[PDB]
Amino acid sequence: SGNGAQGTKFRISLGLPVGAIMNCADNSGARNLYIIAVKGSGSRLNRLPAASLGDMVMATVKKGKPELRKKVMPAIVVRQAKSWRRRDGVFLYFEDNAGVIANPKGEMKGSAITGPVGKECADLWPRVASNSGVVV
Template sequence: MGATKFARPRTSYGLCNGSRILIADNSGAKIAQIINVDGYKGRIRRLPKATVGSVCTVTIKKGKPELRGNIVKAVIVRQKMIYRRLDGTRLCFEDNA
């Protein structure tokens, strides 16, 4: 089976269910927890994992009182775990966001 036009390159999954991430926008939320990874096709009893570019469902854990506890969608933009780009460079950040 060849790669399709829309296939994402395989990157290291650095975040799983329950991981806490920083919020990188100005909405007032500070920290969120991943509760689901949209589109993750895994195995039975295996926790969904996310990487840079994954769309996740998160719950807000710390921030403005009116946002705390809300369930929202988020995109992973940074991860601590090293991942490799298609051109061979390796990249990691100091936080998960």
């Protein structure tokens, strides 16, 4: 929520620490992404930096096509699993964790996105919402 982020994101619950493997929502060859860092996180002794819905993270593809493997690169979270509260009132949670890969300007490498995408993620990133299928 900063690197070319059009708008400001309200706080939500932190689902994915470093070491989590979310799925790959896009169709650019990658199968699943191992999160190593969060762009724009704090620093406290012993605390793991934790991503959430709409954040940008540094990820390495573990399972997938051989070109994407073995090179750290940016990505965006599109579905969570740890439930979060919206200002409107209701709590909600997706079935599984997922995220698209994208260059640091915030532009989609893949063509389309399978499954639903969060409304908090869609507004913060314009190029995600261009290819987005179901918005919540």
